[PDB]
Amino acid sequence: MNIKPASEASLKDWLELRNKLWSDSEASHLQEMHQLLAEKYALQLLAYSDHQAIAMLEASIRFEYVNGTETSPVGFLEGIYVLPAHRRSGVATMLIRQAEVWAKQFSCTEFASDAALDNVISHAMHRSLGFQETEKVVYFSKKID
Amino acid sequence: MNIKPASEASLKDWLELRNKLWSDSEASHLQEMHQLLAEKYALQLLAYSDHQAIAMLEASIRFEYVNGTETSPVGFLEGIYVLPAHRRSGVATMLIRQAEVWAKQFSCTEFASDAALDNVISHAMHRSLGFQETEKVVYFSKKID
Numbered sequence: 001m002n003i004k005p006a007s008e009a010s011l012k013d014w015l016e017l018r019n020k021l022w023s024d025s026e027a028s029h030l031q032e033m034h035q036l037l038a039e040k041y042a043l044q045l046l047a048y049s050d051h052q053a054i055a056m057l058e059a060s061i062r063f064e065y066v067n068g069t070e071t072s073p074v075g076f077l078e079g080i081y082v083l084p085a086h087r088r089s090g091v092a093t094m095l096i097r098q099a100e101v102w103a104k105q106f107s108c109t110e111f112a113s114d115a116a117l118d119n120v121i122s123h124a125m126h127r128s129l130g131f132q133e134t135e136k137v138v139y140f141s142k143k144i145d
Numbered sequence: 146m147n148i149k150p151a152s153e154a155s156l157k158d159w160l161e162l163r164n165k166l167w168s169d170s171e172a173s174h175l176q177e178m179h180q181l182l183a184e185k186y187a188l189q190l191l192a193y194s195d196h197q198a199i200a201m202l203e204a205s206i207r208f209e210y211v212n213g214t215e216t217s218p219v220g221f222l223e224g225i226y227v228l229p230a231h232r233r234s235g236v237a238t239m240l241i242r243q244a245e246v247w248a249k250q251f252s253c254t255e256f257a258s259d260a261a262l263d264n265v266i267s268h269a270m271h272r273s274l275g276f277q278e279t280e281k282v283v284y285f286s287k288k289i290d
């Protein structure tokens with residue numbers, strides 16, 4: 001078991017794991033992925049076993065208010081995905097604590113995350129990772145003019 | 146009739162409208178107030194009629210990702226409150242309007258807002274201001290160490 005930060009050579013591995021986490025086009029993924037590698041407050045970790053990417057974790061540092069938090073800035077889990085076969089092997093636990101370490105570096109005392117209201121699978125994963133539910137919100141949007 | 150930005154001369158009027166939107170002590174309100182005034186990315190509008198303050202609006206500019214939005218940065222409604230007697234004036238609409246113009250200076254094309262899942266009368270208020278629901282989200286938090 002090995003954990004590496006994502007890079008340009010890690011791009012293909014990252015993508016196909018990212019492909020399963022979020023629903024988007026390949027073009028949008030790779031565009032989002034490229035700009036994350038050049039971000040100061042963005043964490044991309046890849047987990048390896050037998051030289052094969054089996055899981056991934058993306059996180060960031062949030063300076064703007066996160067719903068449910070009491071400090072700022074805070075660590076934020078953008079998403080974490082583990083291959084359906086290498087699940088139940090405690091790799092998500094491994095990735096998440098190294099994310100906490102990374103965020104601890106920036107003197108963060110609090111790690112936050114969000115899930116859709118109906119994604120019970122992710123809700124369970126969060127509870128297994130040490131998170132407690134804070135609040136539930138409804139988001140709105142509107143075009144200017 | 147007259148909409149004016151909050152000022153240090155209008156703290157008390159701003160205060161009496163803000164506490165009934167966020168329950169908190171006067172000392173702590175005033176402290177966040179004094180910082181918002183000095184914050185370039187924050188907006189504080191007071192609505193006047195009959196020489197009294199009947200409504201208030203607070204908004205900000207978000208560069209970090211906001212649930213449901215498609216662009217960045219975005220304008221973000223922090224809170225809007227109108228005196229019960231004046232909730233048929235269109236004052237809220239005008240306030241939103243003046244907030245969107247403000248967000249235009251930062252090249253925002255989207256205006257986002259959030260609300261408690263249980264606050265159903267706030268959802269109606271958003272909908273009557275042109276806001277459309279985007280995502281329902283549950284948040285999590287976890288202390289580092």
Ligand SMILES: [Cl-]
Binds near residue numbers: 079080081
């Ligand atoms: Cl996730």
Ligand SMILES: [Cl-]
Binds near residue numbers: 114115116119122
């Ligand atoms: Cl989700």
Ligand SMILES: [Cl-]
Binds near residue numbers: 231
């Ligand atoms: Cl009233």
Ligand SMILES: [Mg+2]
Binds near residue numbers: 077078079113114115
């Ligand atoms: Mg999330």
Ligand SMILES: [Mg+2]
Binds near residue numbers: 222223259260
């Ligand atoms: Mg809100």
